[PDB]
Amino acid sequence: FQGMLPRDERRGQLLVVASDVFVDRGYHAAGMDEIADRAGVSKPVLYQHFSSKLELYLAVLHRHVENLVSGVHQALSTTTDNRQRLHVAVQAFFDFIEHDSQGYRLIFENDFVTEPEVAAQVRVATESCIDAVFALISADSGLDPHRARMIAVGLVGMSVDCARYWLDADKPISKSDAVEGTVQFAWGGLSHVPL
Amino acid sequence: FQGMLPRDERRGQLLVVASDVFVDRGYHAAGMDEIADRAGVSKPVLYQHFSSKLELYLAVLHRHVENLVSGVHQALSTTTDNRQRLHVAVQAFFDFIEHDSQGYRLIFENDFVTEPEVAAQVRVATESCIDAVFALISADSGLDPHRARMIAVGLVGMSVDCARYWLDADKPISKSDAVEGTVQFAWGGLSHVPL
Ligand SMILES: [Cl-]
Ligand SMILES: [Cl-]
Ligand SMILES: [Cl-]
Ligand SMILES: [Cl-]
């Protein structure tokens, strides 16, 4: 099947450059001329790969979303020892936001409100993570769907909030401490906070 | 002291009417003429109490914020048995969002972005709840300030997220079940979800 054929190496390089420009300028100020300039490709070659600035922006957003979502899903498939996969998944999330700073900004601090499809892509990806957690909670607990879904939302939201606090506070503790603190709270709740 | 003198009964009635109009119309479409009309007061009497539509909007927002924030603080002073005050506080929050629907919309679904002071009033009130939780976690645990603050953000955020999910899903379970589910997850974490 053609979906297994080698990835377009030039496409990947163009997305990295486009991500730099979109994050630096914002969507409206960013231009295909600057992206072509910085990619070292002619503007017609850039247009052969991406017929519009919007298609390129959505491709950049998707590359960052897929990086995070695949990392979270892969974490959840490592083990069915829930305490352990909770750490692998929270770790994957902190690893993403620390490593892929442009991705963090594009997903969690998106200001391109003029295009509803951008906010929708963020919601559908967020819902993919909540759905993955909901599927595990439903399967591994006696909670009925309504209760499992509320806890899945609480768990994902609590995780996002701890991480955003840590990153927005300029990393006041190590990433390993921030991940472990978030995991211990998610697993044991207030009842297991050190006394 | 003059701060203990009786409340202005007409002021309170005007705020209830103003809240109806602001929620129904949005800030920009709302007018002092409609508020005066519905309050059964003359427009000069309305202006004797509130010199501008913005002052009236901020007074409406504050009345709703104070309702929630005082309810949360009072819940936290009822008992130092943390498992119990966690329920009293989460209950106070669900009671507010269910009873004070206009307050829920004005605080959690605010669309008046043209006035930065509106978003700031919501943030400073949110921070008052996080600060109250942080003060308890710091005092009742061995967590240092950075770790206590991250957990306080996670706890408040998780609570807001469970409640917003419940309300946005048209209350698929009873408020008592939604409160208890949120409290049990906050207290015991994933480790104590029914098996
Ligand atoms: Cl490709
Ligand atoms: Cl960046
Ligand atoms: Cl008064
Ligand atoms: Cl309402």
Numbering used by the authors:
A (entry chain A), B (entry chain A): 31 to 225
Q: What does the article say, verbatim?
A:
We had previously identified the transcription factor FasR, as a key activator of fas and acpS gene expression. fas and acpS, respectively, coding for FAS I synthase and 4-phosphopantetheinyl transferase (essential to produce functional ACP), form a single operon in Mtb. FasR:DNA binding is regulated by long-chain acyl-CoAs, which are themselves products of FAS I, namely acyl-CoAs ≥ C16 disrupt the interaction of Mtb FasR with its cognate DNA6. We have now determined the 3D structures of FasR from Mtb, in three different states obtained with the protein (i) crystallised alone, (ii) co-crystallised in complex with the fatty acid C20-acyl-CoA and (iii) in complex with a double-stranded DNA oligonucleotide bearing the specific FasR-binding sequence.
FasRΔ33 readily crystallised in the absence of added ligands and also in complex with acyl C20-CoA (arachinoyl- or arachidoyl-CoA). A striking feature of FasRΔ33-C20-CoA is a tunnel-like cavity, delimited by helices α4, α5, α7 and α8, with its two openings towards the bottom and the top of the EBD. C20-CoA binds within this tunnel, in a parallel orientation with respect to core helices α4, α5 and α7. The tunnel is ~28 Å long, with a predominance of hydrophobic residues on its wall pointing their side chains towards the lumen of the tunnel. Towards the cavity’s upper entrance, most of the 4′-phosphopantetheine portion of the CoA cofactor is also observed, the sulfur atom (due to its stronger electron density) was instrumental in positioning the whole C20-CoA moiety. Electron density becomes less clear towards the tip of the pantoic group, likely due to high mobility of the CoA portion, eventually vanishing in the region corresponding to the 3′-phosphoadenosine diphosphate group, which were thus not included in the final model. In FasRΔ33-C20-CoA, the dimer is opened up, with both protomers separating away from each other, compared with FasRΔ33-C14. Using the position of conserved Tyr77 Cα as a reference (at the centre of helix α3, key to mediate DNA-binding), the two HTH domains in FasRΔ33-C14 are ~48 Å apart, vs ~57 Å in FasRΔ33-C20-CoA. Taking the above observations together, we hypothesize that binding of a ligand, long enough to fill up the entire hydrophobic tunnel, stabilises the FasR dimer in a more rigid configuration, fixing an open HTH geometry that is incompatible to bind DNA. A fully extended C20 acyl chain measures 26.5 Å, within the FasR-C20-CoA tunnel the acyl shows some bending reducing that length to ~20 Å. The latter magnitude is enough for the C20 chain to fully occupy the tunnel, its distal tip located immediately beside the bottom opening that leads to the space between protomers in the dimer.
